[PDB]
């Protein structure tokens, strides 16, 4: 079983030993207590959050804009609570979920500002030597949201 130290005995990636679960749960309790005691006192600055809206995830900071390629059937200026938050970070901690953070923990709220068309997008097909040539113009519907609040609850 014992092997002398040659070139290829112990593989070149470093050997790390996993800590036992008892002191590691002690460690996790210490870390979660630190981070929650930061959150209860507001020891953070401003927050960002990766948020899985329409079909794709946005990295959202408060007070900003998000253009979404569909019409959301909401009157303009209307507040929305963007559920499916899936990372929330600050200057000194982050909280990522598996995959989603709970609704009891993070609230992200936005509005609907404007409900536009896009620019005309030309769809031309052409096949050569064959008199095949078609043209279409597609104006897609787009709605622009402004994200107001990223507020975080100290429920850990």
């Amino acid at each position: 079983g014992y092997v002398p130290k040659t070139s290829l005995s112990s593989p070149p990636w470093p050997e790390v030993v996993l800590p036992d679960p008892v002191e590691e749960t002690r460690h996790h309790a210490e870390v979660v207590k630190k981070v929650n005691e930061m959150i209860v006192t507001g020891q953070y600055g401003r927050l960002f959050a990766v948020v899985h809206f329409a079909s794709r995830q946005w990295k959202v900071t408060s007070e900003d804009l998000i253009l979404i390629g569909n019409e959301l059937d909401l009157a303009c200026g209307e507040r929305i609570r963007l559920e499916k938050v899936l990372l929330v970070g600050a200057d000194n901690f982050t909280l990522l979920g598996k995959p989603l953070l709970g609704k009891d923990l993070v609230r992200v709220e936005a509005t609907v500002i404007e409900k536009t068309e896009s620019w005309p997008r030309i769809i031309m097909r052409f096949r050569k030597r064959k008199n095949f040539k078609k043209k279409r113009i597609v104006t897609t519907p787009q709605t622009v949201l402004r994200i107001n609040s990223i507020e975080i609850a100290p429920c850990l």
């Binding site: 079983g1 092997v3 002398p4 040659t6 070139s7 290829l8 005995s9 593989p11 070149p12 990636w13």
Partner: protein, 146 residues
């Protein structure tokens, strides 16, 4: 070992034999490579394992004396060749371009003036294929031909 001291009087004197380290972790094997669990666990690099099996003028010891398997003797023989040509056993000289893993002898390879098409390329051999059985700590295996 014994030495032949000459001066005219010539004599043969046995002087100071080493001996094996006490406990082989897997005894009742055949070759000393088996008895210490090193069947597929060395390279050309390691010059202690290679340097134990070598005449003090760089040549390698016969099978019937050192007691190897045939396979591990050929492997250690090729590893000695590749450790000498890289410059890793400098004390074992018979009495400047830098290499390693040279399969073939340096002054006897004709250069590749026509590497072929891609479907029949002439490649540059690297290392030896007698070490094809080592441990693979990689997903992409040893490219033995370059």
């Amino acid at each position: 070992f014994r030495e032949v001291v000459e001066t005219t009087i010539i004599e043969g004197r046995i002087t100071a034999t080493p001996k094996e380290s006490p406990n082989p972790p897997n005894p009742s094997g055949q070759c000393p490579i088996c008895r210490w669990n090193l069947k597929h666990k060395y390279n050309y690099d390691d010059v202690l394992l290679l340097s134990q099996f070598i005449r003090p003028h760089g040549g390698m010891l016969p099978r019937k004396i050192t007691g190897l398997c045939q396979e591990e003797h050929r492997k250690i023989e090729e590893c000695v060749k590749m450790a000498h040509r890289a410059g890793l056993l400098p004390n074992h000289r018979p009495r400047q371009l830098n290499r390693y893993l040279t399969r073939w002898a340096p002054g006897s390879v004709k250069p590749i003036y026509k590497k072929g098409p891609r479907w029949n390329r002439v490649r540059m051999p690297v290392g030896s294929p007698l070490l094809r059985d080592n441990v693979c700590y990689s997903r992409t295996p040893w490219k033995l031909y370059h």
